[PDB]
Amino acid sequence: VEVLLGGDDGSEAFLPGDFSVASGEEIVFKNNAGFPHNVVFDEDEIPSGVDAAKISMSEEDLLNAPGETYKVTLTEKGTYKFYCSPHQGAGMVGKVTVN
Ligand SMILES: [Cu+2]
Numbered sequence: 001v002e003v004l005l006g007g008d009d010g011s012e013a014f015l016p017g018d019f020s021v022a023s024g025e026e027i028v029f030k031n032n033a034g035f036p037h038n039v040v041f042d043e044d045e046i047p048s049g050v051d052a053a054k055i056s057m058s059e060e061d062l063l064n065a066p067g068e069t070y071k072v073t074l075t076e077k078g079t080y081k082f083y084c085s086p087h088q089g090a091g092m093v094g095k096v097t098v099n
Helices: none
Strands: 002-005 018-021 026-031 069-073 078-083 093-098
Touching: none
Parallel strands: 002 026, 018 093
Antiparallel strands: 026 069, 078 093
């Protein structure tokens, strides 16, 4: 699945923002507009025994040009909440359910 970081209008949302993937399916986050964006997984809201450091972007690495990607694959089944650091306050949060 591909997930846009920002709507074209600069809306601060993941698109889609609440989706499902199979274990092992690649998630392609694509910088869209309204950047800077990144993707961090909330360690309190992901399945037990998943290291959030392995699936989150590096803290200082922000996507700042259109089309730039961050690719990640989740395996442990469950729900995962993730967010954009800069726009967390503004409601740029998402949810993926791995099945
Ligand atoms: Cu953002």
